[PDB]
Symmetry: D2
Subunit: 106 residues, 4 copies
């Protein structure tokens, strides 16, 4: 059926539902699951794309919007739109955020 799984990054240690083994054709009691081992089951034509897709989604920019009101010093209240980008270093920790801010009060 649907296999549950958990990867521990720091160690690469991998945990697999019996469902997952059935899917991969591996053997529960014996097959020691690690990220590196997982990638050997991955079709060779696919290994490289899957690494880039993981990285893109996990380390790369996942944009997003926040709307909020601000208060000018003269008490004026503006509706802004903030477009947010995330910049992560190798580790995954935010290095910086950046983006635009649009005054929508029109």
């Amino acid at each position: 059926g649907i296999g549950s799984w958990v990867l521990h990054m720091e160690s690469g240690r991998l945990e697999w539902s019996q469902a997952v083994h059935d899917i991969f054709g591996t053997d529960s009691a014996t097959f020691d699951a690690t990220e590196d081992a997982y990638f050997q089951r991955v079709h060779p034509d696919d290994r490289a794309r899957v690494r880039r897709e993981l990285d893109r989604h996990v380390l790369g920019d996942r944009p997003f919007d926040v709307e909020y009101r601000i208060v000018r010093p003269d008490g004026q209240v503006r509706e802004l739109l903030e477009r947010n980008h995330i910049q992560r270093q190798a580790s995954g920790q935010v290095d910086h955020l950046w983006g635009t801010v649009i005054d929508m009060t029109e």
Copy 2:
């Protein structure tokens, strides 16, 4: 009108860089504004500050699940098409602690 504003928030430094275009939409002075994240929140409507904090944290630090398709090759030589749902779980630091999720064999 000064148009679109662009900005950078340094995490280590905490430094917040504003183009004069931002300062303009905020009604502030380049020369005199603290340029920090807190300073920004002091300028944000009081009724909105918690919400925004949560929405940021939710995007920068929350789970942002996704799919991946790929074939695997079983030990028995058989080829399988998989759908895999990924969930990320970070530490307060941003560092990814665990990924986790599900795989579906959709091989027909």
Copy 3:
């Protein structure tokens, strides 16, 4: 506490289905509440209604770009790895009018 509420908004019908759990967080009566999208907005803080409308519209109807990787095969027999960025452009109806974007040959 009645806990989590779940809800469905029918588009054609405009009908809005609430579990009693929602009615509970809203302080309303199942038997007496109109169960429509407008009714919902009348119950939403006045300072928030425009924002929410925009955020919905932005998610349901806005561009939601994405990536796709795949190999192509040139007429000359050569194999290439592509990165493709997709942007969707809908009609007020939701119907997708155009997709559009970019492709990068990342073949090494």
Copy 4:
């Protein structure tokens, strides 16, 4: 370089930057671009995955959150969290939205 492109859904008519032709190895002046034609350039091992990925992203559920305050009849003001799912029919038109609403006022 980076190729620009536009697909017109209703017709499947396809528009291609010269950049795109260079990439696909096709010939600007002659090669008539359509969605169906595009898919013939797609590697055969990839054709099927690319269709499912398009569909998933374009017709499928793209969840999202909205936070907002409500007003109980007794003037009480609650902060809620709304989790939104989108349900599209074949056409792409929203059939319905659905989801949860969580009272955060704690």
